[PDB]
Design a protein around this ligand. Structure first.
Ligand code: ZN
Lengths: 204, 78, 128, 99, 60, 154
RNA sequence: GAAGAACCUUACCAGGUCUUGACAUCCUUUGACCACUCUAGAGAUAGAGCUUUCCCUUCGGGGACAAAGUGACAGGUGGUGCAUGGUUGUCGUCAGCUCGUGUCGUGAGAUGUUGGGUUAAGUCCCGCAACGAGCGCAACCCUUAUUGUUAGUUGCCAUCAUUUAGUUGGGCACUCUAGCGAGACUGCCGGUGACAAACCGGAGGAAGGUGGGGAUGACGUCAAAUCAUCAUGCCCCUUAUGACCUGGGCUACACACGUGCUACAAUGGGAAGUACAACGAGUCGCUAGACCGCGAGGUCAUGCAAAUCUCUUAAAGCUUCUCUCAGUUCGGAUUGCAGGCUGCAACUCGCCUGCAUGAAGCCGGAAUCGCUAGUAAUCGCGGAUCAGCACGCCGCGGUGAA
């Protein structure tokens, strides 16, 4: 109970938020509307698996977007699913939604689907060591300078937790011109919960 | 308060307005914690309910500046 | 007409000095040497650089400063004489500097940390 | 001269780059621009503890910075008024217009 | 007994001095920010999520 | 402290008396920086000296520096835990510290029913061989070479 | 934690109750739903009436839910931080903790990481059987101490006039604000020191040897604490533990202890005048001017989306008499009265003024702790949760020891 969440250190220095906003005269409404966006496309994320979700505002229109990892999973064939999700969202939005869907180039840059996939093999009965090692090896075969893991729970179908998961390369944590990424997931087969504190590093 | 309008609860007032010039009754079960007294209330005996068990009290003429709940506390102190 | 311009910044109070050749006075908020100030308007405090340059002088001062108490914005008086002698005499500047007279105090109110009472005053460690 | 607008947002660089864009469009059709006035940037305070059940002393605070810009225009023309009534881009930054 | 007090405050009040507010995703009655309509600790955490507009860390 | 030595911050003289140690006497009674009450009634007390058995305040301040002057000092420097000390040679820094602390904290001990007549009689005592602060110099002369029974194995 | 207990907030008792229930899925009547008042009631409620009115149609149905009754139930601040995730304390800002090639020992293992002087520091130099590579540390990040240029309003007073005011003639002159820069980095010099680090002294400089301060806490150490933020497997119920109302109470006092405030006095008071900022808050929220009050305040009515205007011209000093040494012009404890304001209402259970008794306290015993400088010690301003409710909190400024 001693570390500082690193994504809160680098925010407001080199990175930017999910908001090009000056929230005046309607604050909690857009707040717990963005939260409704989060709770409503939460069921849309099991197969589509976007990473970054950006919001902008037009004159009287809502201009948001999604950055997915897989192109055809939500754009469909001739715009079938996109218009349907616009219609589903417009009842929660109450304003003209106008979106765009961007395919990531070189699509293994994400740290979100890394956590989602390691939670997938952890919820599909794989032991703890070689899953983490094959995760860091397949990240190295793509190319990344450092990947750390601090796993806990009721590990490998047994009793009281550990704090393990091992690494590769040099990794600047305490520097500030670093651009490091972090994620925490919830993951469980049946024994309580086994979270994953994952880490990557790409190099400036 | 009282001089910028007496604070007496209206439907309990309507319970005691029904028997203004009538005989002094024995029991009126109520809650009796919010309404104060202005002197046209003399003579009654209204069951003051503390919160657990109601205890009645009769009414003289001297009661001019307080409520009914100032005599049945919430203590049971012994 | 002849007048001077000397600014001074101590204890969060800028002090523009409209120095004019006179006999040695002050119109601070257009008020004289004790129309604004109590008895703590001391000689070596205020009139220090007159003993090294323009001895004994002096010239009459016009100034408008607020910020600090009586002893705080009086500390801004020395910067006015410093910048005035900076304007006037280049050769006495070394006698000023070797006597100091220009080293601005970089001190403000100290940052007061949470978890404690004050900037440094920790709470009473009531152990037992 | 009967034209003035305000520019208010969080940061500084997007505000004054958009201010230079609209100053460009203003003094293009005419002349006589005033200053892109920096406003002294009102600041907020918050004070939030770190833990849930105990440990009040572990503070972790947050604040807000809100830069503001005022723009006046001297000796206008109908063309700069048309530029300021049909162009409010960028949309990520909000402005406060008058005349 | 928590789900009664979530739907409790969405009523119009019985009289004027019962208009107390709380968070919306959670239900903390103490230390809610009326300019946020969020509680204490969810402001810190969702601020670390990088989703609240504005707010940065503070050092001076 | 533990690492090494440290500075001492010598005081500036007065722009009225033109004497440094008078400022050192000023800066030991003054509570909360209240120069307005305490220092001015010290001025009043030395002018009481000037009006009764005195001519100039600087000379009688030097006369007080005579008759209060700590000539020696001890400091408890244990080795094995026991009461171990020796009459050390006093620094004129720490001489002024001890003597003016005697004067000021005996003006605390005096406590007369006028807020400057306690100061007036205090400096009439400390300037003219009387008062228990001069007798504190006497008692400082006393324990000088009286704890010497355990101060000759040095 | 509880950043505001008069009900609610609220867990805990007394009374009045209900059971696909307020909540979660759907059918069904297919209704437009709610809108509108009366009787009694502590209400939860028991009992009535009005219009309420298809809100798309290739006239089919589904787009509206009060509603009706139902199923699988929903649900639970009931345990489980010693099954959990997460989050936070802890040494502690502590500098420690590792790896590859070469080499030693039969082997577990060792050498880098040891010996001298250097720094706040595993930072650096010289000797090293070790040659090289890391996380930490420093470091870039913010604030702020100095200045240049750029920008002048709602701010500033250079050239002068009017002034109750800097009104508008005047521009950003000084100032100020914020934009890019320059800046303090052993940057240069003398000596010590092997010529090595480093040290002692200078010059310039506003800032000299990382300027002051913040953000940033490695491996781990401690079954530390959190199921009362939320998720959460396991054991329990679901005509009740789930849900709705009225009064209470978490504010009671036979005692002990931790914390904050006030004097215990001739460094304290009263009459008089006279001063000096910063951070902010602000359009059902802050009040210009005037009136009337011992007063809490009320009244007419103006401004204010902010560099304009409201809190908002801060206090201890400065100069006179004073109580002139007392339970006292030290001090104000509890009590009767005039009230004032918030609220649906201030006995339980808000705060404040004034009038009237003038309590105790007459400098604190072991044992303690804060702190090495615009800091201790001391005096004022604003803000939060908030209709009202600070000796607490979080900042800001004023005087300023050893
Ligand atoms: Zn919350």
């Amino acid at each position: 109970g001693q570390k500082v969440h690193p994504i809160g250190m680098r925010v407001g220095i080199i990175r930017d938020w999910d908001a090009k906003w000056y929230a005046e005269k309607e604050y909690a409404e857009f707040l717990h509307e963005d939260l409704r966006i989060r709770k409503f496309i939460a069921t849309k994320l099991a197969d589509a698996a976007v990473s970054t979700i950006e919001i902008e505002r037009a004159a009287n229109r809502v201009n948001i977007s999604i950055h997915t990892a897989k192109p055809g999973m939500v754009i469909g064939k001739g715009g079938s699913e996109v218009e349907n999700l616009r219609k589903e969202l417009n009842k929660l939005t109450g304003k003209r939604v106008h979106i765009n869907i961007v395919e990531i180039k070189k699509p293994d840059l994400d740290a979100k689907l890394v956590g989602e996939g390691i939670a997938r093999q952890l919820e599909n009965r794989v032991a703890f060591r070689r899953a983490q090692k094959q995760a860091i090896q397949r990240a190295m075969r793509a190319g990344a300078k450092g990947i750390k893991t601090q796993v806990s729970g009721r590990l490998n179908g047994a009793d009281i937790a550990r704090s393990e998961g091992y690494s590769e390369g040099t990794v600047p944590l305490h520097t500030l011109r670093a651009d490091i990424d972090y994620a925490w997931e919830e993951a469980d087969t049946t024994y309580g919960k086994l979270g994953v504190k994952v880490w990557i590093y790409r190099g400036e | 308060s009282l001089k910028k309008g007496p604070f007496v609860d209206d439907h309990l007032m309507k319970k005691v307005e029904a028997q203004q010039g009538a005989e002094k009754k024995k029991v009126i079960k109520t809650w009796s914690r919010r309404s104060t007294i202005f002197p046209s209330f003399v003579g009654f005996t209204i069951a003051v309910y503390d919160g657990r068990k109601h205890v009645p009290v009769y009414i003289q003429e001297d009661m001019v500046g307080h409520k009914l709940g100032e005599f049945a506390p919430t203590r049971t102190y012994r | 007409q002849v007048q001077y311009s000397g600014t001074g910044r101590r204890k969060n109070a800028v002090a523009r000095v409209r120095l004019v050749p006179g006999t040695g006075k002050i119109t601070v908020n257009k008020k004289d040497v004790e129309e604004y100030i109590p008895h703590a308007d001391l000689r070596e405090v205020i009139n220090q650089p007159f003993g090294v340059t323009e001895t004994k002088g002096a010239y009459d001062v016009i100034v408008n400063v607020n910020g600090g108490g009586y002893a705080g914005q009086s500390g801004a008086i020395r910067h006015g004489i410093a910048r005035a002698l900076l304007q006037v005499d280049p050769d006495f500047r070394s006698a000023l500097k070797r006597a100091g007279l220009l080293t601005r105090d970089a001190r403000m109110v100290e940052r007061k940390k949470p978890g404690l009472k004050k900037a440094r005053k920790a709470s009473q460690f009531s152990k037992r | 001269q009967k034209i003035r607008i305000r520019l208010k947002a969080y940061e500084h660089r997007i505000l004054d780059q958009s201010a230079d864009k609209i100053v460009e469009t203003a003094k293009r059709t005419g002349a006589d621009v005033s200053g892109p006035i920096p406003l002294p940037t009102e600041r907020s305070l918050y004070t939030v503890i770190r833990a849930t059940h105990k440990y009040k002393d572990s503070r972790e605070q947050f604040e807000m910075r809100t830069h503001k810009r005022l723009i006046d225009i001297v000796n206008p023309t109908p063309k700069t008024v048309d530029a300021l009534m049909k162009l409010d881009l960028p949309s990520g930054v909000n402005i406060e217009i008058k005349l | 007994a928590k789900k009664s007090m979530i739907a409790k405050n969405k009523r119009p009040a019985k009289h004027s001095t019962q208009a107390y507010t709380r968070c919306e995703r959670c239900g903390r009655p103490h230390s809610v920010y009326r300019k946020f309509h969020l509680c204490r600790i969810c402001f810190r955490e969702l601020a670390y999520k990088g989703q609240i507009p504005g707010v940065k860390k503070a050092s001076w | 402290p533990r690492k090494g030595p440290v500075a001492k911050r010598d005081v500036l003289p007065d722009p009225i008396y033109n004497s440094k140690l008078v400022t050192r006497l000023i800066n030991r009674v003054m509570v909360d920086g209240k120069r307005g009450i305490a220092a001015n009634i010290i001025y009043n007390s030395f002018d009481i000296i000037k009006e009764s058995t005195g001519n100039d305040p600087l000379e009688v301040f030097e006369q007080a520096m005579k008759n209060v002057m700590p000539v020696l000092e001890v400091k408890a420097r244990r080795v094995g835990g026991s009461n171990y000390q020796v009459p050390v040679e006093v620094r004129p820094e720490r001489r002024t510290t001890l003597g003016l602390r005697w004067v000021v904290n005996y003006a605390r001990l005096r406590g007369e029913h006028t807020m400057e007549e306690r100061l007036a009689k205090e400096i009439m005592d400390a300037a003219n061989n009387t008062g228990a602060s001069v007798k504190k110099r006497e008692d400082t002369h006393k324990m000088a070479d009286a704890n010497r029974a355990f101060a000759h194995y040095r």
